[PDB]
């Protein structure tokens, strides 16, 4: 069937195609059906929705489609029904515990990217993986395939370094400190973090506060070529398109298969050509990886995955028991990260890790002799050499290099919690702290967040103030105070 | 977040809720997020889509919502973000192979019915079941749970007799024959079949040809009380709502868990109060249950699940390699079924199968002494008692009891295939035959269908006509013809 394309001012989270009830009847189309719309070489797969808003002869396509495909309104396109994808058979084999040929895996991924496979197919694929699992040969094929289906950036500078944190730890703004520090060494390190969805803040969310996160792949390359490093948001560029789609499925079912995760993390690195990668695995209660033993295995998996991909990889296992620094939430986190870079003096938890992680990278780069990596990082930070590099990144990013950290604005409405009884602080719960911060409105409101005046092992006396809640809106503050009250995140004994 | 409901003329195949870009930002709502909309007692769960269509201060709900919920346009409603359902935790357990507690099973079903669990979650439950299976204890719990959350009809006449064929066989118009015959005996048998989704025709489609198929539960009870039987569509009433929602995922994945299938089939019967259910398992090549050994196993399961539900279940394994009778398609099937009832004579496959199934029900009903049911069924059919009874159903369903079968319309455009060679017919492919019928336009076009002038084992000299294609549009028929030529549904050797 041929109909003229009509743009729709709507975002459904899916490629939505609207078809006339009468016109649809001719094609035998039904709601939620998959139809392939094509004009020239380019074609797109959409999920049918029947509405009378669109007249006979017109096809309605939502704006979601416009981002990756260029279709001009009033354009004539051919809309034809789509058969069930061939890849589904492959999903089934995995479902049955069978190993997957590289060819079978590639087809599944390509469909995921082209959108022939929707939520149902993907949730099933993700579910199958969790129950049955992926062996190492499969993971690598999956990793390479995920990278291949998406845009890849080629950069002249070498060696290229990357740093990653599996996460699950609040206020981990350490990467912001590490990249500036490493670049000063003159190594090239282009970081691409992502905005927070299930967390109070994201590296990208923190960066937006003092700079502009979004950039073109080409623009990203130019910045890296001159600055030597960048701190841009991952979502805008087309890297590992498959990884993000699968994640929606993982977040909903609250399950993260290790094979998919290893593959997903490395897929982005391989695409950008990172040659040396450092992965930080925060191990501890209330963190994604609970024990050292689990981390130790995960580290081995990451290193081996690198060998298959041609990447030299090293992993660091770090504590994830307590939030890093005393600041949680994007506005608060940016001030803390930046003040530390400028001052050269910062919270010990944030400072030691950044230098230490950075140190591992410096040695890998070849810049520093083995065992002196942590120390070299300390000198760069103290020198203020690190701060200048950050200024360069900020200037390149369009941020104001002349900005002052004290100047950044925290939330106007705040409530502070004080200790119920005298004691020593045995533990701090990440989920509760992040949950409270999120209630406070992070990361939608940069101002909102939490500030901790205490750290684990710290002695406390009655009336001492454990943490303060910052909220942009008073209505938000009550919800945060209430959630915080039930949780009693800080424990004293 | 108070808002005035606005109804949008669109069918998304999902409970779509449209929100303003400005309004959504304030509420931290994103595309495809789950939201709970409630007024007074009424509440509904929908997926947020960001739109311009709806002005600020308004929320848009598609027509799908209107079906089960009385929401009036301009109605003032409150909109809050829905959290992840507690049930997903349970889905995970099944994911890990754990047996499911009844409360846990019950929770998943209620959530599935309530629409809290969308496409991603349901697929996982379904994927997990196929991958890990369902225990017999769970199936009864699932089956009862499904029945419990939907409308149930308590019919006064007892005992209540039901007949069901897992089908997969082309041209199965047998049930139409079974119900009238059984009804004549004075037994009560209320059948609610469903329109074809992947078949050329459905019992529901055939019935619509000579009588209205859509009816209310209250309307439905009344006919049975007086008529003693009915042939109405399953879809119109809200019975076992979960079966349909889950079914879409299975069809999409082209899988059918045994535990899920039994619960789905059995759930409807439990709801209607059927006390004596007869299951017909068509075993043969190209039929759902391919082997007799597989079919027998299925039969043991249906009976055991019956005991658990307090129902006397009996299974009859029949042959399904060739299409029943000589007609495929709704217009064609109705004429054949009706002609046989009026005449008391018709094709052997339909009459023998129909009488035998009917006989088992009669024996079950106490109406006949053991071993005498088929003979009695033939007498009722031969007597014409059956045909008289059909007219009572046809009348009450709103059709002319005076309709002359021969009169019923068939497609104007037809093509006939003849024997390429001489020999004996070794086999017929239902999948091929059904595919051709569908291409012709079945079941949307009643006229479309196929007519077989041959049965397996018949000897045909070269040039003998094999089957005839009926279509209501030349375009459809030609497409079918090509398919038919490509297919070669009849094998002679």
UniProtKB/Swiss-Prot annotation, chains A, B:
GO cellular component: cytosol
Keywords on record: Allosteric enzyme, Glycosyltransferase, Transferase
Reaction catalysis annotation: AMP + phosphate = alpha-D-ribose 1,5-bisphosphate + adenine; CMP + phosphate = cytosine + alpha-D-ribose 1,5-bisphosphate; UMP + phosphate = alpha-D-ribose 1,5-bisphosphate + uracil
Record-linked InterPro entries: AMP_phosphorylase, Glycosyl_Trfase_fam3, Glycosyl_Trfase_fam3_N_dom, Glycosyl_Trfase_fam3_N_dom_sf, Nuc_phospho_transferase, PYNP-like_C_sf, PYNP_C, Pyrmidine_PPase_CS
One Pfam entry name: Glycos_transf_3
Active site: 256
Consequence the record notes for mutating residue 288 to A: Almost complete loss of activity
Induction: Constitutively expressed (at protein level). Does not respond to the addition of nucleosides.
The protein's Enzyme Commission number: 2.4.2.57
GO molecular function term, any single one: AMP binding
A GO biological process held by the record: pyrimidine deoxyribonucleoside metabolic process
Residues noted as binding AMP in the record, renumbered to the chain: 168, 194-199, 203, 264, 288
Activity regulation field: AMP phosphorolysis is allosterically regulated by the substrate AMP.
Top-rank lineage group of the source organism: Archaea
Record function comment: Catalyzes the conversion of AMP and phosphate to adenine and ribose 1,5-bisphosphate (R15P). Exhibits phosphorylase activity toward CMP, dCMP and UMP in addition to AMP. Functions in an archaeal AMP degradation pathway, together with R15P isomerase and RubisCO.
Domain remark text: The N-terminal domain (residues 1-84), characteristic of archaeal AMPpases, is essential for enzymatic activity, participating in multimerization as well as domain closure of the active site upon substrate binding. Harbors two dimer interfaces within a single molecule: one by the central domain and the other by the C-terminal domain; these two interactions can continuously occur in a repetitive manner, leading to multimerization.
NCBIfam families, sorted: AMP_phos, ARCH_P_rylase, PRK04350.1
Subunit (UniProt): Forms an exceptionally large macromolecular structure (>40-mers) in solution.
Family under the similarity heading: Belongs to the thymidine/pyrimidine-nucleoside phosphorylase family. Type 2 subfamily.
Name of the protein: AMP phosphorylase
Natural source organism: Thermococcus kodakarensis (strain ATCC BAA-918 / JCM 12380 / KOD1) (Pyrococcus kodakaraensis (strain KOD1))
Lineage: Archaea, Methanobacteriati, Methanobacteriota, Thermococci, Thermococcales
């Amino acid at each position: 069937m041929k109909a003229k394309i009509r743009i729709l001012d709507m975002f459904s989270g899916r490629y939505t195609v609207l078809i006339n009830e009468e016109d649809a009847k001719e094609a035998k189309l039904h709601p939620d059906d998959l139809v392939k719309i094509e004009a020239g070489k380019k074609a797109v797969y959409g999920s049918v929705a029947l509405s009378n808003l669109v007249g006979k002869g017109e096809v309605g396509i939502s704006r979601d489609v416009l981002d990756l495909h260029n279709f001009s309104e009033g354009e004539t396109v051919s809309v034809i029904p789509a058969g069930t994808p061939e890849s589904v058979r492959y999903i089934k084999k995995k479902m049955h515990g069978e190993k997957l040929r590289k060819v079978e895996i590639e087809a599944i991924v390509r469909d995921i990217v082209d959108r022939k496979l929707r939520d149902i197919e993907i949730s099933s694929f993700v579910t199958a993986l969790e129950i049955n699992g992926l062996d190492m040969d499969e993971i690598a094929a999956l990793t390479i395939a995920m990278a291949e289906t998406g845009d890849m950036l080629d950069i002249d500078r070498k060696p290229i370094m990357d740093v990653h944190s599996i996460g699950g730890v609040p206020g981990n703004k350490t990467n912001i400190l590490v990249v500036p520090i490493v670049a000063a060494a003159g190594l090239t390190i282009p970081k691409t973090s992502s905005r927070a969805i299930t967390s109070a803040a994201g590296t990208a969310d923190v960066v937006e506060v003092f700079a502009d996160v979004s950039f073109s792949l080409d623009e990203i390359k130019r910045i890296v070529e001159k600055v030597g490093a960048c701190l841009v948001w991952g979502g805008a560029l087309n890297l590992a398109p498959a990884d993000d789609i699968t994640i929606k499925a993982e977040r909903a079912l609250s399950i993260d298969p290790t094979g998919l995760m290893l593959a997903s993390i490395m897929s982005k690195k391989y695409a950008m050509g990172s040659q040396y990668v450092l992965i930080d695995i925060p191990t501890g209660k209330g963190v994604k990886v609970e024990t050292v033993e689990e981390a130790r295995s995960l580290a081995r998996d990451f290193i081996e995955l690198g060998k298959r991909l041609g990447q030299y990889v090293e992993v660091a296992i770090t504590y994830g028991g307590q939030p890093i620094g005393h600041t949680v939430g994007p506005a608060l986190e940016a001030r803390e990260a930046l003040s530390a870079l400028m001052t050269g003096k910062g919270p010990g938890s944030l400072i030691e890790k950044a230098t230490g992680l950075a140190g591992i990278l410096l040695e890998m780069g070849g810049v520093a002799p083995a065992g002196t990596g942590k120390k070299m990082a300390k000198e760069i930070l103290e020198s203020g050499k690190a701060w200048e590099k950050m200024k360069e990144i900020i200037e390149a990013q369009g941020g104001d290099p002349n900005i002052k950290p004290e100047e950044i604005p925290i939330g106007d409405k705040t409530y502070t919690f004080t200790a119920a009884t005298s004691g020593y602080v045995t533990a701090i719960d990440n989920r509760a702290i992040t949950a409270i911060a999120r209630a406070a409105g992070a990361p939608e409101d940069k101002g909102a967040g939490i500030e901790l005046y205490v750290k684990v092992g710290e002695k406390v006396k009655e009336g001492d103030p454990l943490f303060t809640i910052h909220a942009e809106h008073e209505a938000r503050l009550d919800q945060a105070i209430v959630l915080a009250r039930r949780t009693e995140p800080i424990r004293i004994e």
